[PDB]
């Protein structure tokens, strides 16, 4: 599972912003354009990779959408939706660029863990 | 496009933190499925990647990099065999070298890691 560090949670939250999403609501659809990533801080997000694949359940501290964030014109690999009332850190393209500028070391450590996760990965 | 290519800054800094390696035409650098914790940058010649099955070979010329998965992911097994098509020269960057690089220039590394992710999401033959 994902899981940010405490330092990441605090900083991504400050550079990004919070987003509330109700039980049953869609955050984005599979195959859609999307340039922001998200961190679950309360509740649960379900990822739907289409076809007959297992759903992934993401609880507090887990992140997703970094591909949309990091790769231009990426199409969302899964649909994202809220299982229950949830709250998220939403981090946009510009926010991430700011973060890299202010704290490249922390970002490098994050990107590194991302790569490990993403080569793991793909149902 | 979708070919690697380091920046000039990367080439110089990866060269300095790492070391150089000569490899003769026909020689294997590593086998597919093996343990491997270093990455490589081609600076002369050409490295061929063999992904097994019936997949196309990939040909990497000067300035192209490979093996970063082995470098970044513990207990990764090499996704391809690597071998020299012609006499080649490489920058070899070891695990410890990369950690030194991160510590001295995190910003350069972050930019590199970012470019890696794009390449890798656009990979797998
Ligand atoms: N493609 C893929 N994406 C995954 C997987 N597990 C989690 N994800 C995340 O699901 C996300 C959906 O949005 P993106 O396409 O932006 O980024 C994706 C990944 O960050 C997986 O196994 N495969
Ligand atoms: N998995 C994968 N690796 C690739 C591809 N093209 C180039 N590579 C590189 O091939 C390398 C084989 O060694 P590694 O797995 O160390 O690291 C890998 C990458 O740097 C591709 O299409 N798929």
Residue numbers in the entry:
A (entry chain B): 25 to 147
B (entry chain A): 23 to 147
Please share text taken word for word from the publication where this structure appeared.
To further characterise the binding of cyclic GMP by the cNMP domain of XC_0249, we determined the crystal structure of the domain with the nucleotide bound to a resolution of 2.2 Å. The XC_0249 cyclic NMP-binding domain crystallises as a dimer. The Fo-Fc electron density map of the complex showed a clear electron density for cyclic GMP adopting a syn configuration when bound to the protein, that is with the ribose H1’ and guanine H8 bonds oriented in the same direction. Cyclic GMP makes a number of contacts with the residues surrounding the ligand-binding pocket. A number of these residues form specific H bonds with the ribose 2′-OH, phosphate lactone oxygen atoms and, importantly, with the guanine base. Residue E146 is especially interesting, as it is located within the opposing αC helix, with its two carboxylate oxygen atoms forming two crucial H bonds with the guanine N1 and N2 atoms. N145 is also a critical residue, as its side chain amide nitrogen atom forms one H bond with the guanine O6 atom. In addition, potential hydrophobic interactions are also involved in cyclic GMP binding; F73 is involved in a perpendicular C–H bond/purine base interaction, and L91 and V142 are involved in interactions at the other face of the ligand with the ribose and guanine base. The XC_0249 cyclic NMP domain dimer exhibits an interface area of 1344 Å2, and each cyclic GMP exhibits an interface area of ∼300 Å2, giving a ΔG of −2.9 kcal mol−1 as calculated using the PISA program. The major difference between the two structures is the diad motif of N145 and E146, which form strong H bonds with the guanine base of cyclic GMP and which contribute to cyclic GMP binding.
One candidate cyclic GMP effector is XC_0249, a protein with a predicted cyclic mononucleotide-binding (cNMP) domain attached to a GGDEF domain that is active in synthesis of cyclic di-GMP. Our data suggest that the action of cyclic GMP in Xcc depends in part on XC_0249, which has a cyclic GMP-binding domain attached to a GGDEF domain active in cyclic di-GMP synthesis. The findings showed that cyclic GMP addition led to an increase in the activity of XC_0249 in cyclic di-GMP synthesis. Mutation of either XC_0250 or XC_0249 led to a reduced virulence to plants and reduced biofilm formation in vitro. These findings describe a regulatory pathway in which cyclic GMP regulates virulence and biofilm formation through interaction with a novel effector that directly links cyclic GMP and cyclic di-GMP signalling.
